[PDB]
Design an enzyme around this catalytic site. Sequence first.
Site, PDB file in Angstrom:
ATOM      1  N   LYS B  10       0.824  -0.988   0.009  1.00 12.74           N
ATOM      2  CA  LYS B  10      -0.122   0.108   0.094  1.00 12.74           C
ATOM      3  C   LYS B  10       0.887   1.327   0.064  1.00 12.74           C
ATOM      4  O   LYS B  10       1.872   1.340   0.700  1.00 12.74           O
ATOM      5  CB  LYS B  10      -0.851  -0.071   1.217  1.00 12.74           C
ATOM      6  CG  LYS B  10      -2.122   0.802   1.052  1.00 12.74           C
ATOM      7  CD  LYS B  10      -3.192   0.327   0.091  1.00 12.74           C
ATOM      8  CE  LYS B  10      -4.490   0.385   0.268  1.00 12.74           C
ATOM      9  NZ  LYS B  10      -5.306  -0.455  -0.611  1.00 12.74           N
ATOM     10  N   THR B  57      -3.917  -5.554   0.395  1.00 12.99           N
ATOM     11  CA  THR B  57      -3.163  -4.268   0.924  1.00 12.99           C
ATOM     12  C   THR B  57      -4.074  -3.332   1.586  1.00 12.99           C
ATOM     13  O   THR B  57      -3.411  -2.591   2.431  1.00 12.99           O
ATOM     14  CB  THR B  57      -2.889  -3.443  -0.593  1.00 12.99           C
ATOM     15  OG1 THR B  57      -4.141  -3.341  -1.203  1.00 12.99           O
ATOM     16  CG2 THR B  57      -2.328  -4.275  -1.448  1.00 12.99           C
ATOM     17  N   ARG B 176      29.692  33.513  -9.294  1.00 17.10           N
ATOM     18  CA  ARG B 176      28.212  33.238  -9.933  1.00 17.10           C
ATOM     19  C   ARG B 176      27.334  33.120  -8.555  1.00 17.10           C
ATOM     20  O   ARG B 176      27.634  32.881  -7.467  1.00 17.10           O
ATOM     21  CB  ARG B 176      28.357  31.777 -11.024  1.00 17.10           C
ATOM     22  CG  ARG B 176      28.787  30.718 -10.067  1.00 17.10           C
ATOM     23  CD  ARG B 176      28.784  29.497 -10.983  1.00 17.10           C
ATOM     24  NE  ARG B 176      29.001  28.293 -10.084  1.00 17.10           N
ATOM     25  CZ  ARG B 176      28.980  27.258 -10.542  1.00 17.10           C
ATOM     26  NH1 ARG B 176      28.642  26.909 -11.898  1.00 17.10           N
ATOM     27  NH2 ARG B 176      29.164  26.115  -9.737  1.00 17.10           N
ATOM     28  N   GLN B 228      30.436  19.861  -7.309  1.00 21.73           N
ATOM     29  CA  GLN B 228      31.210  18.488  -6.777  1.00 21.73           C
ATOM     30  C   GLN B 228      32.140  18.766  -5.357  1.00 21.73           C
ATOM     31  O   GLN B 228      32.026  17.895  -4.529  1.00 21.73           O
ATOM     32  CB  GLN B 228      32.194  18.289  -8.015  1.00 21.73           C
ATOM     33  CG  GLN B 228      31.251  17.590  -9.398  1.00 21.73           C
ATOM     34  CD  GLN B 228      30.669  18.581  -9.973  1.00 21.73           C
ATOM     35  OE1 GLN B 228      30.638  19.794  -9.611  1.00 21.73           O
ATOM     36  NE2 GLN B 228      30.710  18.127 -11.546  1.00 21.73           N
ATOM     37  N   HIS B 256      20.227  26.953 -12.397  1.00 25.45           N
ATOM     38  CA  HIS B 256      20.927  28.114 -13.079  1.00 25.45           C
ATOM     39  C   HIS B 256      19.978  29.213 -13.055  1.00 25.45           C
ATOM     40  O   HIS B 256      18.868  29.371 -13.402  1.00 25.45           O
ATOM     41  CB  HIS B 256      21.216  27.772 -14.674  1.00 25.45           C
ATOM     42  CG  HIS B 256      21.937  26.251 -14.858  1.00 25.45           C
ATOM     43  ND1 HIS B 256      23.264  26.137 -14.219  1.00 25.45           N
ATOM     44  CD2 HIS B 256      21.526  25.106 -15.221  1.00 25.45           C
ATOM     45  CE1 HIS B 256      23.563  24.728 -14.247  1.00 25.45           C
ATOM     46  NE2 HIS B 256      22.440  24.240 -15.217  1.00 25.45           N
TER      47      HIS B 256
HETATM   48  O1  LIG Z   1      29.564  23.527 -10.325  1.00 26.91           O
HETATM   49  C1  LIG Z   1      29.361  23.040 -11.507  1.00 26.91           C
HETATM   50  N1  LIG Z   1      29.512  21.658 -11.866  1.00 26.91           N
HETATM   51  C2  LIG Z   1      29.611  21.302 -13.078  1.00 26.91           C
HETATM   52  O2  LIG Z   1      29.870  20.151 -13.194  1.00 26.91           O
HETATM   53  C3  LIG Z   1      29.141  22.144 -14.174  1.00 26.91           C
HETATM   54  N2  LIG Z   1      29.062  21.998 -15.547  1.00 26.91           N
HETATM   55  N3  LIG Z   1      28.548  23.122 -15.976  1.00 26.91           N
HETATM   56  N4  LIG Z   1      28.471  24.117 -14.680  1.00 26.91           N
HETATM   57  C4  LIG Z   1      29.051  23.525 -13.691  1.00 26.91           C
HETATM   58  N5  LIG Z   1      28.890  23.901 -12.369  1.00 26.91           N
HETATM   59  O1  LIG Z   2      -6.091  -7.074  -6.955  1.00 23.21           O
HETATM   60  C1  LIG Z   2      -5.792  -6.910  -5.694  1.00 23.21           C
HETATM   61  N1  LIG Z   2      -4.631  -7.242  -4.943  1.00 23.21           N
HETATM   62  C2  LIG Z   2      -4.143  -7.041  -3.884  1.00 23.21           C
HETATM   63  O2  LIG Z   2      -3.301  -7.685  -3.134  1.00 23.21           O
HETATM   64  C3  LIG Z   2      -5.254  -6.494  -3.088  1.00 23.21           C
HETATM   65  N2  LIG Z   2      -5.336  -6.255  -1.740  1.00 23.21           N
HETATM   66  N3  LIG Z   2      -6.169  -5.653  -1.545  1.00 23.21           N
HETATM   67  N4  LIG Z   2      -7.177  -5.468  -2.927  1.00 23.21           N
HETATM   68  C4  LIG Z   2      -6.380  -5.973  -3.765  1.00 23.21           C
HETATM   69  N5  LIG Z   2      -6.906  -6.379  -4.918  1.00 23.21           N
END
Ligand SMILES: O=c1[nH]c(=O)c2nn[nH]c2[nH]1
Ligand SMILES: O=c1[nH]c(=O)c2nn[nH]c2[nH]1
Lengths: 295, 295, 295, 295
Positions: B10, B57, B176, B228, B256
């Site tokens: 779920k 579920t 920058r 980096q 950017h």
């Molecule tokens: O900090 C940056 N890392 C990068 O790899 C990069 N490539 N273009 N500008 C950038 N600035």
């Molecule tokens: O098709 C279903 N599968 C499941 O596992 C399920 N669990 N509740 N309702 C459901 N319906």
Amino acid sequence: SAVKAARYGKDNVRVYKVHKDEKTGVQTVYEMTVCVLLEGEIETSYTKADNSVIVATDSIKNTIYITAKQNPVTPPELFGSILGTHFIEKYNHIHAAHVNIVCHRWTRMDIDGKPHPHSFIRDSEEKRNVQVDVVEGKGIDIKSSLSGLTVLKSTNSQFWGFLRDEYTTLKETWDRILSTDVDATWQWKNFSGLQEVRSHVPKFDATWATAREVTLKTFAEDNSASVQATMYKMAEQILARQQLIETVEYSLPNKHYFEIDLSWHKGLQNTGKNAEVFAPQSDPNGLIKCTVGRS
Amino acid sequence: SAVKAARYGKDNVRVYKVHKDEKTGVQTVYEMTVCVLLEGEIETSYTKADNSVIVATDSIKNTIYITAKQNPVTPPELFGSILGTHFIEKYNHIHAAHVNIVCHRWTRMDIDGKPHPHSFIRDSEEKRNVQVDVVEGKGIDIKSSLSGLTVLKSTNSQFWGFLRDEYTTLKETWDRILSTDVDATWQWKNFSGLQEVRSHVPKFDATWATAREVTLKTFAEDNSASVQATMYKMAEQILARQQLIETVEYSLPNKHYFEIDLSWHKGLQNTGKNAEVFAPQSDPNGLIKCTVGRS
Amino acid sequence: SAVKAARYGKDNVRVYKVHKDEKTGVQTVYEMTVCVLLEGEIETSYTKADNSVIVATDSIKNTIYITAKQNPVTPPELFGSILGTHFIEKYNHIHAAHVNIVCHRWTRMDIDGKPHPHSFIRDSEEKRNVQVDVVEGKGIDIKSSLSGLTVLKSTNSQFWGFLRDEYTTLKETWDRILSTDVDATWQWKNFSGLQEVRSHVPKFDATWATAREVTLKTFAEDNSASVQATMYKMAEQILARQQLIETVEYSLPNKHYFEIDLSWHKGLQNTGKNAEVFAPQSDPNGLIKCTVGRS
Amino acid sequence: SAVKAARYGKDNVRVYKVHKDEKTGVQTVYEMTVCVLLEGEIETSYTKADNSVIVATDSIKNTIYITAKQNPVTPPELFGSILGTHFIEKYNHIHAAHVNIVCHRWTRMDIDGKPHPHSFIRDSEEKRNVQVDVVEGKGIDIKSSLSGLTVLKSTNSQFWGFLRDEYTTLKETWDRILSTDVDATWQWKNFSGLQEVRSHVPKFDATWATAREVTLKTFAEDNSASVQATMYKMAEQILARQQLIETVEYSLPNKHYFEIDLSWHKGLQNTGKNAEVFAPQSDPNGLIKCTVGRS
Ligand SMILES: O=c1[nH]c(=O)c2nn[nH]c2[nH]1
Ligand SMILES: O=c1[nH]c(=O)c2nn[nH]c2[nH]1
Ligand SMILES: O=c1[nH]c(=O)c2nn[nH]c2[nH]1
Ligand SMILES: O=c1[nH]c(=O)c2nn[nH]c2[nH]1
Ligand code: NA
Ligand code: NA
Ligand code: NA
Ligand code: NA
Ligand SMILES: [Xe]
Ligand SMILES: [Xe]
Ligand SMILES: [Xe]
Ligand SMILES: [Xe]
């Protein structure tokens, strides 16, 4: 057929500006997304393929950058008014400019308990917005807003005494979770033009801060009878604190958290006073709006 | 044909839990989204329509709520280990549980300079996550992470001395903007089972806090030669501060911000030392990864 | 500390290419989003700030455009292999390239029952994807996929005979709605290099079409005992129809539609055989995976 | 302070309905998302905490399901009118209902060239929407729309002869890519009440189909002088084909695809007549609106 209304322009223009204090070394950044739509004597571009009346949307984009270069971008109410006024003054046949600005948060980082000179964090997706309508001969109408402020209180919210009929299954309650995303808009009295907007510049940031503070405090402290009653209290206080606001509008989703009955499993008690685990509901949601003005 | 691998469960189970201190009146909320996938002797449900091997579920969903009701949900490393262990102990034919948990921020509000007892704000979409793999006879493998931490510095980033060939147009730079969304994962040494996870409970919150602090400080203070080089410094420091971590992985987009040449307009100077207004680029983006371990 | 793994490159590179038939006047468009990550002898960029080993990510972006200019971009398996091979052949110290491509739908419009020469519609957000790993001395590994195919059947799905214990509330059913978003991946046998990929070019589009057809037909026609049983049938048929595929993986959400009991209102009957109005649930959802290979 | 305007209700209510033909065995599904907001004499809920005037939003949700159970849900114009009329007739103090409906596509699958009786596919995120305002004593105002229709043409679009001044860098062009997401709204003449809406039921689906057909054909066939000129042609034709429509509004983003100059690399020619590879731009975008009515 006839053109009844027309507007056109550039949306989603992202803008960043940096201010560098050469003395202190401190840098401050602003980042916004801007939309500008124009109206005027442009019907012939639609009806006769007459492009001579069109200020190209690409030129509108250029203008936003140039205007940001030559003017302060804060408060956004002022920047929007400068930008809108430009188009109606520059182009004879353009008679209205509609400017929407979304301001993104870049909050200065605190490193080891001191404010860093050039490093910032996005603390939340809360926005500060403005809508500015500049209409030739009718002045400048400004709506300011905050949006995307998400809050929750785990108690001190109630909801009882509502209408009950054959469509009703909801149980009355004296203790529930209340959670919402706040959208609050305050509309300024009409300004005659840029000179008047400039004269009120200090009020814009102060009123935004007040609106935020009143919203948070009222939400936290009100023993809420409903979203309706709590939101009205917020709006009332904002109108009391700033006479230049004419109306306050709130639009609030009611984001539901449901109790989970676990009693089918070994008599486990998880409802009413025993409720500890809840299921947040993505949808549906209540939506509650109100516009409050002066008597 | 044959089943080579199978898992089912779920996803997107939203859970809220409240803790109420009856003495102080203080309430604390936790909200998570949980995914649980199971593996084991379940091939026949696929190949022979034998549903007798399937824990539904829907039952998995019920189990998450019941487990949250009866156990602490913090730190998430512990909750995930409890939840995963449940399935492998309860069902003979289930031999592995994979639990992913995303923790959402609900930060206590400060109203008038004091912490409010039951009101919270979502300050940012930053998440704290865990992945817990509980495998019968092989213990508990836990990966902890933070994600969605968005930062920007407006200077003190450089990028020069890279390979230049006939595919290269990028200019070298000594000043920058650097902005990224941080995804950082630390992988714990394998634990023998729940007793051992319980014995290390205080280290989980402390190491998350340390990872966050080291990331923010290093980013703010490093005169960065590249993404980096800066990211390696972060990872090195985390490994030095927590001996129970085996590896640290960072995955960093390089978001950017481009200079805008405005010189075509009245000789306006907006590049190099004169750059004030920039255009944030939504795409493309650099993507830089590294996994750092011990000698 | 030591670098255990490292890869870096450019993500989210959007590319459009048009082909113009000068004879017929017919134009055909392709639009993709491309990610290229490189690995090799680049540890010193992280550990010693040695940028001389870095092919700049901006250059990687340039290379994608140039390669698209000089080569066919379809089928994506071929384009990805050309692109990946380029980097490992061009740069001595780069030993692996990882290329991900998402192909967006631009379907030729039919206007008045005839195919239009240069007008297209996006019919659905379904994607065709490839992952290509080109590793020096180890050949080319290609995984092809379709994703975002959303289907629903309103009957001929059952789910009964599953494990029932003290965690179980789900009722057995002989008639339910089944709806899912299909993610299906087929992994090709390893290819020795580009010459071999080129020799199999016609199989790529044909196998994608077959995978799509088998998925749709099996879903529509199977009187489904579970998602598990139906998905296995799909995978089995794909493996039977293309001997060059080694494995087929499906990942399927079970998007639930719940009955709504309306009997509280005037005895209205809306459950079991009388069920007409249902509530689609946004979350949680079942998630069911399987990888099927050859005996 | 005073309440100037107020509305409240339930948003994001997901609804599925199935119709089963007992004779042919054919099943047809409908899926919608519905929002209902009410107005009336409800000010006291805001100002006096008087919940007795509130029809709970949870009851509004129940009402949507019950109404879907007892009435046809197609065409959406009729369903919305039934739903809105219910609230103003049932509750004395409610004087307006505002109903928004988004219809999701579930298209019957063709398996081996024949229509399948109970299997469906979501072919695109295109929506069919309605807004219905039911106001006591003022009738029913209906706006119908299509949205999310994404198209592209690779030639037969031009843009030249626009205003050029000191803010302009855009080059005139006689051959460009044009791509947009279509949002088109047609507003019906006011209806006196449900009886009148019922009398026009066949026109709703027919006019939606016509609006779609006219949009697609005009886009594909017009040698477009601008977005403005092409959109006007669409609106004009819709008004000519359905006399019960009063206005047609289009809102169209201009999604830009930029040429990439590759001449820096070995003199590669990729601009003007030689343009083959383009860079789609995510932002900014042109936004062009027009409302067309009758002379
Ligand atoms: O900090 C940056 N890392 C990068 O790899 C990069 N490539 N273009 N500008 C950038 N600035
Ligand atoms: O098709 C279903 N599968 C499941 O596992 C399920 N669990 N509740 N309702 C459901 N319906
Ligand atoms: O069709 C267009 N309309 C416009 O208003 C415009 N402005 N720049 N490019 C444009 N294209
Ligand atoms: O605060 C609330 N206001 C409402 O109108 C409502 N309706 N259901 N629950 C509710 N809670
Ligand atoms: Na003017
Ligand atoms: Na077991
Ligand atoms: Na190489
Ligand atoms: Na009424
Ligand atoms: Xe800005
Ligand atoms: Xe939780
Ligand atoms: Xe492409
Ligand atoms: Xe519906």
